[PDB]
């Protein structure tokens, strides 16, 4: 509402609002009445003695009063004939006189002294002259010199006093005209003078809510109106900066007295250009030929468990049996969230839930083969000796249950561990720095990362010693065949993985790591149930 | 050097001191030719430049100068001589008069106007009479003056201000303002502006600040300095030294008031003041000497039995119960004793570390071959009912342990590598607090997997007591598995006890009684084991 006064005004009163603008503007034309009797004053009102614009008008203020104070003590005097003699009179002179050599900006001073006007005036400071014509401290509003055309003094005040005399009150007043054109012009905010706490081209209104910590004054708000002088302040103009966000400073348009969108350059980044900053692009085209794979290989993964329900009574499958047969097949569709929980976004939830389907889809898949492995070593070694008719799922997926109790109590241990540091650290979500100055989110390693990655290497020696012991037994078959080479496969192209994913940590855009994510599994995983399952419908 | 400059004049000025510090002193005050005559305040300068004695000495001078100026207008007045007339005199009245109401701290204001003496002085503010009695220049300045008479009496310092007349050589005479500072702080004694600016402020400063880091000496009065003139409401803080914990804290020891002195006590480790006891735990070195005493030679007596049972090692009965996995217990049960002496020692980081070495490879050790020892002799009797008979000693027993002691390494290596990287960010280890007493002692704090490996013992304990439920018929000969059965239910037992009870009040234990229960609780299960695996050897045959 402050800041459209202020335009209102302006057209309110005509061919001023040019002279606002220009400090000169008189200078260049003038032919007008007296004009400019009182603009906007003391939009808070008025101000009494406040603002402080300078100690100009204070001090000021003070020799006024001291100075009507002399003639208020020569007012009860006794005797006082006061015959108006030739001496009598230069009396007044003095004090007139008096009244502006103690002052830096000052300008014609008069006193009426009716009683018959007897009225004193003179000139402007250090050079005044003497003519004579033929309550508290009230104030005046901003003024111009009615004479002729305009000129230009520069909305010079008429602050003014009264002196009251004794027998009611005295009919005369003592003049102060305060020259108030070098007067620094507020500061078009914190309110003073008339700039008053808004008083702009749109600080808050337009560019202060989107841009935090708008900033918008600096020294001097939306440089204002002004007209009377250019001091040192050095009037900041388009002074906002509030870093980034979609409000950045406002060098695009709308600039000069007319200022208002300042509403641009916004991509994420502290910068100002279009989207070519951090933030990379992510490839839809790359990314849609990925996850649309990923998931035609999973569900034709579900589907062949019911092709070997239906096929149960086979001569192929029972060998194998059909609860260890399904148990390694169940166990590859969470080795298949790798790369559907990669692909969305970094998180919190979204980054542990990666941790339980690689240790937990390990320990089902290549956690049963090694021990359908081990019994084909101790039934054909032990019946050599003859007895001990061994079993199926019942006495191996009982041996299954504490491999997976030591890994389901870790993953409890380190979820409750790593939930924790939250309140005073996240490392879940880290960022990465490339060559071009751009940064991507995703995963930090929190070093039990290096010792599952050793966990899974010592674990599948067990299984290559037993690849050795089964070499020479003679099989109806040859699954044990086809079981040596998903180990000894598992155990080369994961070691490389993992070298290259602890390497090149940071140095990996989140574009780059399902690439990585996206040859590995379906190089360990695809060929491992391709393995155990295509030799057992065809190829008998 | 500043400081010790009013202590000098103190005596050099007698009489006035106390006048000083007590305002009030002035009414005893009787007789002396006169009272203070000067004061060397030039120490921060001549006169304080934009002085902080308000704004009424900027003020007051303002009233001095632009009536002056006044009268620096009719000095080249022509016709301006006149002879003194009865009007021109009761205009020079009205202009002191203006003088002494321009300002309620202004006192009696003179003005010379010689040429025949015609000086004026007039009483004090809203009561003034007017009386008549018979180079350089720009404002010089006067020393606080006190009024002679006969004592001191009230008003005391009298500023007076005083200004010169150029008369078309000069006018011989001066302008003359008394200005009146019973009403005006002095400063604050500490800044930079009335006497004791930043000096004058003995006892302090550099006596309790570089030992005592962060004095505050001040907090918002250092060293209430001169007083004598008014007690404003900025509230002198004399002793508002805290420096927090330094080696002087506040100084309310002795040397109180003025003479000040002794500033430098209540520091030990913590930020508390009274002796060393209140951030001190009570460490009865009587009773934590006896512990050492009684648990050591139990070492000694576990390690003199391994050669004990090595020297037996043709007898029956050991024979019969296997050498070499019987020397493994006892190794085992030396390395669970090593949970007392770490703790015993105060808490490091090396050393709160192997604590938890010790304890994981030591239960591995012991009560990780109790359990096979006692599944062997169940599969050997399930398959000796019908045909073959396939287990043996130390070889297919002993390097099945084998797998438990390299999970074990490999989670403590995780663990250890996953400790000693937090560091650069927490500590996590040595942390403290109280015992609902404000009295803190350091210890150790809980990583969150000591839960965890917590309840990985009570469910291998488990397999342990189906082991002993599955055998209760066997013909043995030597009642070996019947006191392996007690050995594994009293440890599940009071381990969990003991764990809980640790794990629940573990912020609310003294030093002292942590130690009387890890050594209770290594002398129910530790020292019972290796009492009943042991003794029924040698007798009972
Ligand atoms: C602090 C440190 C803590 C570390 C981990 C904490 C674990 C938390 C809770 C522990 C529970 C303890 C359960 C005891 C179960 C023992 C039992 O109850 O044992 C069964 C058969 O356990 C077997 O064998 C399976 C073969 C061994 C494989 C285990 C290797 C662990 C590796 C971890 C996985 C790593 C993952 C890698 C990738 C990720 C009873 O089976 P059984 O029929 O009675 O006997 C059987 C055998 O046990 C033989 O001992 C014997 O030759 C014959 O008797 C034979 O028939
Ligand atoms: C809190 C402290 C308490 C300590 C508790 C620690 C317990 C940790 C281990 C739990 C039990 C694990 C199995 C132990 C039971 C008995 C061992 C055993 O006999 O297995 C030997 C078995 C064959 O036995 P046989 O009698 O010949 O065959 C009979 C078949 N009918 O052979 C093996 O299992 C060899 C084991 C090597 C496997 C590879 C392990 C390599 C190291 C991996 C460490 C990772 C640990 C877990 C971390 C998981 C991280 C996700
Ligand atoms: C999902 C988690 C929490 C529960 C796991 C507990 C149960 C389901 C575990 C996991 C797999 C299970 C086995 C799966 C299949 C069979 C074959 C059946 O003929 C007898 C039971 C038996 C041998 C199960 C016994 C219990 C078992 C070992
Ligand atoms: C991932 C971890 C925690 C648990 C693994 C779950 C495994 C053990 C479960 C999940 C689904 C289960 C299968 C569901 C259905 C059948 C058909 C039935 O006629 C034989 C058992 C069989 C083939 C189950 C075997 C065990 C199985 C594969
Ligand atoms: C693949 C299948 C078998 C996984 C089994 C479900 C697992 C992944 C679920 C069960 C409970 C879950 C947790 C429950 C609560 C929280 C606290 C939250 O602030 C962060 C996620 C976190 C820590 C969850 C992570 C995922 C979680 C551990
Ligand atoms: C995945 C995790 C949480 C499950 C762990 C629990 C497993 C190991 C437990 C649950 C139920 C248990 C079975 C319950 C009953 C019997 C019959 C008896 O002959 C003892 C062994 C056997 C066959 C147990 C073997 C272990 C077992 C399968
Ligand atoms: C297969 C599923 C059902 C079993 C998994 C159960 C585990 C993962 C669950 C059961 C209870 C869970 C905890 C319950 C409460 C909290 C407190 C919270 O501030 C952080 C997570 C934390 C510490 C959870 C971590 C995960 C947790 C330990
Ligand atoms: C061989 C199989 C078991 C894989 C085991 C993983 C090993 C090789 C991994 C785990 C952690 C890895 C290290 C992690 C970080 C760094 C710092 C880098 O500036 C150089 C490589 C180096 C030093 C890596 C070397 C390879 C490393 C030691
Ligand atoms: C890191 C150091 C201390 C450990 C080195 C040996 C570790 C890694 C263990 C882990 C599993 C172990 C293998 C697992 C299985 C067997 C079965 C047995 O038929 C002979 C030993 C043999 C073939 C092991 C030899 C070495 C081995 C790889
Ligand atoms: C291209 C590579 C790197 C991807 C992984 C595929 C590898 C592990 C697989 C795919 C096909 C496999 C081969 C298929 C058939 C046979 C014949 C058999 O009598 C010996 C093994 C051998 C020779 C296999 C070795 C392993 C093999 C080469
Ligand atoms: C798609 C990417 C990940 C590669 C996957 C290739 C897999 C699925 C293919 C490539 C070569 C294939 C093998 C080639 C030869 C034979 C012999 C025959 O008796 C059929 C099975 C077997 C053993 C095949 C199994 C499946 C196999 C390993
Ligand atoms: C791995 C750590 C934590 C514990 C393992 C220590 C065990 C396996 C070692 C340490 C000292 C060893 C004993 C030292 C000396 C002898 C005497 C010899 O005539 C028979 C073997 C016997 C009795 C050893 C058996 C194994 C033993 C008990
Ligand atoms: C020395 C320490 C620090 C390393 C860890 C100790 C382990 C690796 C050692 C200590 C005692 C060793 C056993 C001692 C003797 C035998 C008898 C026979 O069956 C050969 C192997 C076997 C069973 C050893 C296996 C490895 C073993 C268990
Ligand atoms: C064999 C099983 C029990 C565990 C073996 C662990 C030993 C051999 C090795 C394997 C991987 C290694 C870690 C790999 C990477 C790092 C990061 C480096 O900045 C400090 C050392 C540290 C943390 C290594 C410490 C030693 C380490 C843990
Ligand atoms: C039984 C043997 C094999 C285990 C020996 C333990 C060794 C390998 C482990 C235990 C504690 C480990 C240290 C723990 C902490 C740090 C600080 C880190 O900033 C650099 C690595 C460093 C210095 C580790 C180096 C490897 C370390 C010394
Ligand atoms: C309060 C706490 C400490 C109680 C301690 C538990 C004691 C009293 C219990 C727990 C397990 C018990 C043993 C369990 C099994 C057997 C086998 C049986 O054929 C004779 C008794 C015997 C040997 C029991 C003796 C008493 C026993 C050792
Ligand atoms: C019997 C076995 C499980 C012994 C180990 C106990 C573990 C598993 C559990 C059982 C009950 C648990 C306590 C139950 C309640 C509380 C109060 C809470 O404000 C802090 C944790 C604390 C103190 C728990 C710490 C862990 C705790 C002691
Ligand atoms: C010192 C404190 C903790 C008390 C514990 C002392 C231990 C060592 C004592 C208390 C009771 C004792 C048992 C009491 C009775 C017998 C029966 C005897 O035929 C063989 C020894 C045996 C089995 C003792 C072994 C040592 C024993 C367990
Ligand atoms: C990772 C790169 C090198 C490709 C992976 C190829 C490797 C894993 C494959 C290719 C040929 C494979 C076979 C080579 C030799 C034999 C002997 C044969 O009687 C059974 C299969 C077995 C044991 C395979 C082991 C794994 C093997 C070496
Ligand atoms: C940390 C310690 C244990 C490392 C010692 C390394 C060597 C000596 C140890 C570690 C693990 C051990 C075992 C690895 C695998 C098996 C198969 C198991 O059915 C019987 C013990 C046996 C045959 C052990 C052989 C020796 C072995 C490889």
Not at 94 to 119: D, N
Not at 377 to 398: C, D, E, H, N, W
Not at 401 to 420: E, M
């Amino acid at each position: 509402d402050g800041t459209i006064l202020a335009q209102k005004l302006a057209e309110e009163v005509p061919m001023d609002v040019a002279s606002y603008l220009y400090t000169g503007d008189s200078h260049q034309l003038k032919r007008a009445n007296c004009s400019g009797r009182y603009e906007l004053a003391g939009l808070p009102g008025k101000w009494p003695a406040l603002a402080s614009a300078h100690p100009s008008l204070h001090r000021a203020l003070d020799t006024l009063t001291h100075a009507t104070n002399f003639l208020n003590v020569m007012l009860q005097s006794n005797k006082s004939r006061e015959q108006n003699l030739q001496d009598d009179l230069d009396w007044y002179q003095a004090l007139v006189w008096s009244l502006l050599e103690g002052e830096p900006s000052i300008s014609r001073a008069a006193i009426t002294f009716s009683t018959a006007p007897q009225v004193f005036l003179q000139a402007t400071r250090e050079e005044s002259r003497i003519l004579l014509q033929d309550s508290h401290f009230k104030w005046s509003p901003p003024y111009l010199e009615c004479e002729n055309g305009s000129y230009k003094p520069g909305w010079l005040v008429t602050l003014s006093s009264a002196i009251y005399g004794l027998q009611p009150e005295f009919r005369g007043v003592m003049k102060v005209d305060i020259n108030l054109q070098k007067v620094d012009i507020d500061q078009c905010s914190s309110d003073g003078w008339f700039s008053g706490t808004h008083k702009c081209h749109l600080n808050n209104s337009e560019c202060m809510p989107i841009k935090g910590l708008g900033f918008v004054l600096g020294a001097y708000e939306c440089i204002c109106k002004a007209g009377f002088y250019h001091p040192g302040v050095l009037p900041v103009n388009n002074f906002r900066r509030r870093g980034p966000d979609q409000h950045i400073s406002g060098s695009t348009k709308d600039v000069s007295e007319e200022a208002y969108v300042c509403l641009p350059c916004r991509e994420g980044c502290p910068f100002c250009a279009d989207d070519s900053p951090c933030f990379v692009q992510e490839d839809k085209y790359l990314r849609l030929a990925i996850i649309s794979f990923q998931a035609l290989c999973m569900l034709l993964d579900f589907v062949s468990m019911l092709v070997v329900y239906h096929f149960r009574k086979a001569k192929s499958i029972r060998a194998s049996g059909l609860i260890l047969l399904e148990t390694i097949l169940f166990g590859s569709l969470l080795l298949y969230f790798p790369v559907v929980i990669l692909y969305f976004e970094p998180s919190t939830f979204r980054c542990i839930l990666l941790r339980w389907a690689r240790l937990l889809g390990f320990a089902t898949v290549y956690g049963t083969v090694t021990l359908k492995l081990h019994r084909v070593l101790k039934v054909f070694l032990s019946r050599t000796a003859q007895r001990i008719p061994y079993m199926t799922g019942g006495r191996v997926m009982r041996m299954l249950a504490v491999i997976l109790l030591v890994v389901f109590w870790f993953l409890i241990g380190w979820t409750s561990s790593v939930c924790q540091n939250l309140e005073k650290q996240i490392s879940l979500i880290g960022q990465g720095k490339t060559s071009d100055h751009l940064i991507f989110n995703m995963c930090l390693i929190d070093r039990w990362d290096y010792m599952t990655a050793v966990a899974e290497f010592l674990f599948l020696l067990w299984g290559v010693y037993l690849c050795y012991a089964v070499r020479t037994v003679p099989s109806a078959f040859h699954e044990p065949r086809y079981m040596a080479v998903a180990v000894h496969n598992e155990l080369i192209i994961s070691a490389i993985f993992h070298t290259i994913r602890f390497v090149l940590a940071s140095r990996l855009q989140s574009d780059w790591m399902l690439m990585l994510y996206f040859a590995h599994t379906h190089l360990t995983v695809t060929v491992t149930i391709g393995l155990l399952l295509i030799p057992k419908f065809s190829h008998s």
